[PDB]
Amino acid sequence: KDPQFTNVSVHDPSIVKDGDTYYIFGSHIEAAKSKDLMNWEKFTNGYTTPNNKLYGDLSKNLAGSFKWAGENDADSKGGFAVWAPDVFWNKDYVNEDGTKGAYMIYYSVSSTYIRSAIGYAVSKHIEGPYKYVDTIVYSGFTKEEAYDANSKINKKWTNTNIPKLIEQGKLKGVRADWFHNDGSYNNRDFPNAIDPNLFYDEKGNLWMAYGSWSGGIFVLPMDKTTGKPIYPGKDGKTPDGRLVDRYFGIKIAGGYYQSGEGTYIVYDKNTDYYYLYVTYGWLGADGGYNMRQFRSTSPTGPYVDAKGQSAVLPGEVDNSPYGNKIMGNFLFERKVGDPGTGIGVGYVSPGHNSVYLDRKTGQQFLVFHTRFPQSGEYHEVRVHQMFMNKNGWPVVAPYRYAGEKLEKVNKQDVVGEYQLINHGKDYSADIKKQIFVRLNRNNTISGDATGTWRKIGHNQAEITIDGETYDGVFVRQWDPTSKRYVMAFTALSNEGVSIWGSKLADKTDEEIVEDVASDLDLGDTDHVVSNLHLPTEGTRHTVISWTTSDAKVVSETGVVHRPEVGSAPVTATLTATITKGDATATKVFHITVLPY
């Protein structure tokens, strides 16, 4: 009855459901399918060309886009760069043969941090092969003629699709503000055209939101029929002050060179909210990708967080205060004495997500790529279920989706000790690990934090710590370390902080110290040539202190002193005294140290 998982490495996944089957489409022409959001099979060949699984002859097909960026050019020297797509079924799209209905993949191509463009391709079948249509949004264009190093491409704006639009009367003409004084692209205020996301709204209209760092995230209204932007055509401001551009659209997030990418927007027909997901930080293992969360009553904004702050920054400022941090770097550390093996389950730089909102059950899933502790830049896809908390915010489940659903939750299954992770607001390469609290039968919270708690209705959690209230739900989770299903909670404060709870198994101190003793292993102590690592700490704050029988062979801290060449091997005995509260255990380790 244990869950089975089959993983795949798709960067920047973007989920879509097609009948019985779930599909995700990532960067680098990578894509996979699942029937259960747990077992994925990849079906693509990547950047292979031709016979490219998605695009066929990659270079000739998408050449309309590669005239501008993303092929053997600058940062895509000797390769391609096809980034962060989105895929959906457009029942309204008029084909080349007059019939209506097609799959659309909206993709990015890029060659610098600013020179890039969004284009799209259509197809009879969702697995491809897709067939180019147009290139609709450019960035990194210049006021006069110019070139990037190791690039032959004239960057002047007259090389984009802008002149054609000025002809068709869709734009007045070039906006001066797009350029600095030196005539270069003004990405302080204007976007980098990648990461398109396609969403329908409440009345069934189509929209594309897009962008990464630089000037921010923009949204454009989309002609359901052709697949092309209905450009604003005139500059202006939104009623609340947000920039509207004639070409780029409406600014809904970010700005002033700060991070933010992987836009995904969903209309919730029940809460009547548009939820904006965005990822902060830098994608690699030392860059700290966060996922951030905002909402608006309009698809155009203004999008705000649980604190009621704008996703659009006021200037070059720390962006970390803004947006619900719904997931950062974390590790449910498997300390000495915890069941299972390994370091525990953790993520490094999770993010660039899509969302699937099921029409039948109303269950919501978060879908993202992530790296892992101790694994460098290796990454896999992960799915976490989201549940709607009492304030109209989806709250993310602590663990990957394993078939769980909301249930009636009984108080006696909630009471106990919890490992708790508080994702906070700051972010870095720091991995956040658990503290130890308990939810007591008297509805107080004691341990590494102090406060009160309430179950409300079938499963609503309310957690109060030091005058902050975190609202979310109690829900059952798969803990892959102890290999059991566990009680868990996730809750969100109106500071936009998320806290996670995973319930430890019930144990008394006398049981903890004996679990610690049985787990405490120094490895092979028979042929010792290096220093030994002696853990001073076991699970649930158990102190482990050490003594040695002979400091000349090995110290209290595990530093060994090998005999000089041509000596007899030497031995000492290390004693671990293990104490949790009033309990005590002892374990002895016999050490043999080899001479040089």
Ligand SMILES: OC[C@@H]1O[C@@H](OC[C@@H]2O[C@@H](OC[C@@H]3O[C@@H](OC[C@@H]4O[C@@H](OC[C@@H]5O[C@@H](OC[C@@H]6O[C@@H](OC[C@@H]7O[C@@H](OC[C@@H]8O[C@@H](O)[C@H](O)[C@H]8O)[C@H](O)[C@H]7O)[C@H](O)[C@H]6O)[C@H](O)[C@H]5O)[C@H](O)[C@H]4O)[C@H](O)[C@H]3O)[C@H](O)[C@H]2O)[C@H](O)[C@H]1O
């Ligand atoms: O073999 C069978 C199967 O294979 C196995 O599969 C495993 C495979 O491995 C995966 O590869 C995935 C890896 O990740 C890919 O990377 C992801 C893609 O690229 C991403 O690029 C995004 C970039 O990120 C952002 O950078 C952020 C930011 O933007 C720029 O900012 C700098 C810039 O400079 C400033 O100047 C301003 C000055 O300031 C003012 O004072 C002055 O006036 C101005 O002059 C400017 O303002 C600043 O913005 C910088 O880039 C950075 O700072 C940026 O948005 C993007 O450029 C993209 O998001 C993502 O898609 C990596 O390439 C790939 O290797 C495969 O997927 C997987 O299949 C499997 O195991 C086997 O079965």
